[PDB]
């Protein structure tokens, strides 16, 4: 199993 997809994009910084 590959890593799960994100639910939503991470923020930048």
């Amino acid at each position, epitope marked *: 199993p590959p890593p*799960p*997809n*994100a*639910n939503d*994009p*991470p*923020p930048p910084n």
Partner: antibody, heavy 110, light 113 residues
């Protein structure tokens, strides 16, 4: 998985602090969300912290009420809610990647 | 805020029946990276939610292939090809493209036997 801290009885006007311990995925690679479930089983997003850099984003309804932190050395996320009222009695979930915590039931009562 | 409208409110189905759940967003869920952040969850009675699908159509690990997710833009569907007893509970969609993040109101799947 995500393992949340136990149930809490808290007085009106006081604060509560709950935890969410992560394992089985890369904690710092995904937003850690906190979600309130209402008695009618609606789900209401509170905010997230991205543990990779600490950035938080909130529902305007909870800004100034909720504080979200993340301890990357222990892979544990925390939520504090202050100034509790009767409408803050609820189950609170943490959620990240494919996983949800089991919920923390908070009862606001004197 | 972006409103997620989920129908029906309740599905009452027999074992083996197909089922379909609709989620319509009030604005496009297409993000600037080209991905559409639409997730489906199942919360069985008594339990925490479990994510079934992310990025509209991508099943999570261990989710049976009886589940499929489709859609784009504003109209999304979760389908179950043949309902099994363990599929009961409340399904939710939720969008991760806009702030605040928002959830649909839930569809309760109950089994007739």
């Amino acid at each position: 998985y995500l393992q949340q801290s136990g149930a809490e009885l808290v007085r009106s006007g006081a604060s509560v602090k709950m935890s969410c311990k992560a394992s089985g995925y890369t904690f710092t690679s995904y937003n850690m969300h906190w979600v309130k479930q209402t008695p009618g089983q609606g789900l209401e997003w509170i905010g997230y912290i991205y543990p990779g850099n600490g950035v938080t984003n909130f529902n305007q309804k909870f800004k100034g009420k909720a504080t979200l932190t993340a301890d990357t050395s222990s892979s544990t996320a925390y939520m504090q809610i202050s100034s509790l009222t009767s409408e803050d009695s609820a189950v609170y979930f943490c959620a990240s990647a494919a996983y949800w915590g089991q919920g923390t039931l908070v009862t606001v009562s004197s | 805020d972006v409103v997620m409208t989920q129908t029906p409110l309740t599905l009452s189905v027999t074992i083996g029946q197909p089922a379909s759940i609709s989620c319509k967003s009030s604005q496009s869920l297409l993000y600037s990276d080209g991905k559409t952040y639409l997730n489906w969850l199942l919360q069985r009675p008594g339990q925490s939610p479990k994510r079934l699908i992310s990025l509209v159509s991508e099943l999570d690990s261990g989710v049976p292939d009886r589940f499929t997710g489709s859609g784009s833009g504003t109209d999304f569907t979760l389908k179950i090809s043949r309902v099994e007893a363990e599929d009961l509970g409340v399904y939710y969609c939720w969008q991760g493209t806009h702030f605040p993040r928002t959830f649909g109101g839930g569809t309760k799947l109950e089994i007739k036997r």
